[PDB]
Amino acid sequence: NITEEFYQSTCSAVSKGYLSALRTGWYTSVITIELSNIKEIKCNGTDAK
Amino acid sequence: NITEEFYQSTCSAVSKGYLSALRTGWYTSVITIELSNIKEIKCNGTDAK
């Protein structure tokens, strides 16, 4: 539960009750897409498809 | 109603009760189909349609 205190003496306020999730390091992954080697595209077809 | 008489004396039989529909003349009608004049068909398209 979130709670909060205001300090009139110093014009400040603290909100408590939060839980941490701090990024501390990094994980590295390699994502691949397999590609086709395509040179010339051989067709004299004027077919719309 | 169809009726029939057999004559034993002459080995023959007559079936009566029929009504005529005799073709006696001819009616002539002209049936037409309107055609399109098509010479060359202009296309280099190898499209399947």
PDB file of C-alpha atoms in Angstrom:
ATOM      1  CA  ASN A   1       0.000   0.000   0.000  1.00  0.00           C
ATOM      2  CA  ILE A   2       1.173   3.475  -0.919  1.00  0.00           C
ATOM      3  CA  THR A   3       1.456   5.968   1.925  1.00  0.00           C
ATOM      4  CA  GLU A   4       2.737   9.521   2.022  1.00  0.00           C
ATOM      5  CA  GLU A   5       4.140  11.997   4.545  1.00  0.00           C
ATOM      6  CA  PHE A   6       4.403  15.763   4.151  1.00  0.00           C
ATOM      7  CA  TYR A   7       7.058  17.642   6.095  1.00  0.00           C
ATOM      8  CA  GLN A   8       5.887  21.200   6.699  1.00  0.00           C
ATOM      9  CA  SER A   9       9.316  22.144   8.036  1.00  0.00           C
ATOM     10  CA  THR A  10      11.120  21.515   4.730  1.00  0.00           C
ATOM     11  CA  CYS A  11       8.351  21.758   2.119  1.00  0.00           C
ATOM     12  CA  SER A  12       8.811  18.170   0.961  1.00  0.00           C
ATOM     13  CA  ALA A  13       6.938  14.867   0.855  1.00  0.00           C
ATOM     14  CA  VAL A  14       7.863  11.198   0.717  1.00  0.00           C
ATOM     15  CA  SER A  15       5.715   8.511  -0.889  1.00  0.00           C
ATOM     16  CA  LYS A  16       6.379   5.010   0.468  1.00  0.00           C
ATOM     17  CA  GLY A  17       5.192   1.490  -0.278  1.00  0.00           C
ATOM     18  CA  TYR A  18       6.767   0.916  -3.670  1.00  0.00           C
ATOM     19  CA  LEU A  19       8.699  -2.178  -4.737  1.00  0.00           C
ATOM     20  CA  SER A  20      11.843  -2.028  -6.876  1.00  0.00           C
ATOM     21  CA  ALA A  21      12.626  -3.400 -10.286  1.00  0.00           C
ATOM     22  CA  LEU A  22      16.028  -1.975 -11.120  1.00  0.00           C
ATOM     23  CA  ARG A  23      17.842  -2.664 -14.380  1.00  0.00           C
ATOM     24  CA  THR A  24      21.333  -3.624 -13.246  1.00  0.00           C
ATOM     25  CA  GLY A  25      22.789  -5.450 -16.243  1.00  0.00           C
ATOM     26  CA  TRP A  26      22.041  -6.538 -19.794  1.00  0.00           C
ATOM     27  CA  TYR A  27      21.159  -9.766 -21.576  1.00  0.00           C
ATOM     28  CA  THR A  28      22.069 -10.017 -25.265  1.00  0.00           C
ATOM     29  CA  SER A  29      20.143 -12.176 -27.714  1.00  0.00           C
ATOM     30  CA  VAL A  30      20.694 -12.766 -31.437  1.00  0.00           C
ATOM     31  CA  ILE A  31      17.529 -12.661 -33.550  1.00  0.00           C
ATOM     32  CA  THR A  32      17.744 -14.092 -37.048  1.00  0.00           C
ATOM     33  CA  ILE A  33      15.741 -13.972 -40.252  1.00  0.00           C
ATOM     34  CA  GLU A  34      16.645 -16.520 -42.922  1.00  0.00           C
ATOM     35  CA  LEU A  35      16.903 -14.831 -46.315  1.00  0.00           C
ATOM     36  CA  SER A  36      16.800 -16.106 -49.881  1.00  0.00           C
ATOM     37  CA  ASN A  37      19.548 -15.222 -52.337  1.00  0.00           C
ATOM     38  CA  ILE A  38      17.717 -13.737 -55.314  1.00  0.00           C
ATOM     39  CA  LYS A  39      19.550 -12.332 -58.316  1.00  0.00           C
ATOM     40  CA  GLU A  40      17.678 -11.713 -61.571  1.00  0.00           C
ATOM     41  CA  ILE A  41      13.958 -12.431 -61.713  1.00  0.00           C
ATOM     42  CA  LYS A  42      13.384 -14.310 -64.974  1.00  0.00           C
ATOM     43  CA  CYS A  43      10.058 -13.583 -66.672  1.00  0.00           C
ATOM     44  CA  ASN A  44       8.642 -11.850 -69.740  1.00  0.00           C
ATOM     45  CA  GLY A  45       5.180 -12.369 -68.268  1.00  0.00           C
ATOM     46  CA  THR A  46       3.003  -9.273 -68.167  1.00  0.00           C
ATOM     47  CA  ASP A  47       0.528 -11.264 -66.086  1.00  0.00           C
ATOM     48  CA  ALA A  48      -0.890  -9.100 -63.291  1.00  0.00           C
ATOM     49  CA  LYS A  49      -0.228 -11.714 -60.603  1.00  0.00           C
TER      50      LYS A  49
ATOM     51  CA  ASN B   1     -61.601 -42.081 -74.671  1.00  0.00           C
ATOM     52  CA  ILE B   2     -59.753 -44.629 -76.767  1.00  0.00           C
ATOM     53  CA  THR B   3     -61.749 -47.647 -77.902  1.00  0.00           C
ATOM     54  CA  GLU B   4     -60.853 -50.533 -80.172  1.00  0.00           C
ATOM     55  CA  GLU B   5     -62.595 -53.112 -82.356  1.00  0.00           C
ATOM     56  CA  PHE B   6     -61.124 -56.346 -83.692  1.00  0.00           C
ATOM     57  CA  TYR B   7     -62.544 -57.846 -86.869  1.00  0.00           C
ATOM     58  CA  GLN B   8     -62.024 -61.604 -86.823  1.00  0.00           C
ATOM     59  CA  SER B   9     -63.172 -61.847 -90.436  1.00  0.00           C
ATOM     60  CA  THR B  10     -60.277 -59.776 -91.819  1.00  0.00           C
ATOM     61  CA  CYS B  11     -57.593 -60.045 -89.124  1.00  0.00           C
ATOM     62  CA  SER B  12     -57.561 -56.306 -88.457  1.00  0.00           C
ATOM     63  CA  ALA B  13     -58.349 -53.820 -85.695  1.00  0.00           C
ATOM     64  CA  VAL B  14     -59.335 -50.170 -85.496  1.00  0.00           C
ATOM     65  CA  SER B  15     -58.498 -47.885 -82.582  1.00  0.00           C
ATOM     66  CA  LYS B  16     -60.852 -44.903 -82.253  1.00  0.00           C
ATOM     67  CA  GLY B  17     -61.121 -41.830 -80.053  1.00  0.00           C
ATOM     68  CA  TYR B  18     -58.119 -39.851 -81.229  1.00  0.00           C
ATOM     69  CA  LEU B  19     -58.092 -36.156 -82.117  1.00  0.00           C
ATOM     70  CA  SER B  20     -56.142 -34.742 -85.063  1.00  0.00           C
ATOM     71  CA  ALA B  21     -53.322 -32.264 -85.247  1.00  0.00           C
ATOM     72  CA  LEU B  22     -52.254 -32.316 -88.875  1.00  0.00           C
ATOM     73  CA  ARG B  23     -49.421 -30.201 -90.252  1.00  0.00           C
ATOM     74  CA  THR B  24     -50.937 -28.635 -93.357  1.00  0.00           C
ATOM     75  CA  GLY B  25     -48.675 -25.667 -94.071  1.00  0.00           C
ATOM     76  CA  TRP B  26     -45.571 -23.856 -92.871  1.00  0.00           C
ATOM     77  CA  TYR B  27     -44.779 -20.655 -90.999  1.00  0.00           C
ATOM     78  CA  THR B  28     -41.370 -19.078 -91.620  1.00  0.00           C
ATOM     79  CA  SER B  29     -39.582 -16.961 -89.033  1.00  0.00           C
ATOM     80  CA  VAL B  30     -36.224 -15.172 -89.212  1.00  0.00           C
ATOM     81  CA  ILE B  31     -34.039 -15.577 -86.120  1.00  0.00           C
ATOM     82  CA  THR B  32     -31.129 -13.187 -85.742  1.00  0.00           C
ATOM     83  CA  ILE B  33     -27.948 -12.945 -83.714  1.00  0.00           C
ATOM     84  CA  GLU B  34     -26.186  -9.579 -83.704  1.00  0.00           C
ATOM     85  CA  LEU B  35     -22.460 -10.045 -84.287  1.00  0.00           C
ATOM     86  CA  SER B  36     -19.425  -7.870 -83.646  1.00  0.00           C
ATOM     87  CA  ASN B  37     -16.939  -7.148 -86.414  1.00  0.00           C
ATOM     88  CA  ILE B  38     -13.581  -8.164 -84.961  1.00  0.00           C
ATOM     89  CA  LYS B  39     -10.380  -8.023 -86.982  1.00  0.00           C
ATOM     90  CA  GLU B  40      -7.009  -8.182 -85.223  1.00  0.00           C
ATOM     91  CA  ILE B  41      -6.925  -8.579 -81.453  1.00  0.00           C
ATOM     92  CA  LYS B  42      -4.338  -6.083 -80.201  1.00  0.00           C
ATOM     93  CA  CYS B  43      -2.359  -7.223 -77.158  1.00  0.00           C
ATOM     94  CA  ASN B  44       1.140  -8.317 -76.170  1.00  0.00           C
ATOM     95  CA  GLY B  45      -0.268  -9.293 -72.781  1.00  0.00           C
ATOM     96  CA  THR B  46       0.638 -12.779 -71.614  1.00  0.00           C
ATOM     97  CA  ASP B  47      -1.827 -12.304 -68.765  1.00  0.00           C
ATOM     98  CA  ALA B  48      -3.799 -15.510 -68.177  1.00  0.00           C
ATOM     99  CA  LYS B  49      -7.162 -13.725 -68.169  1.00  0.00           C
TER     100      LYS B  49
END
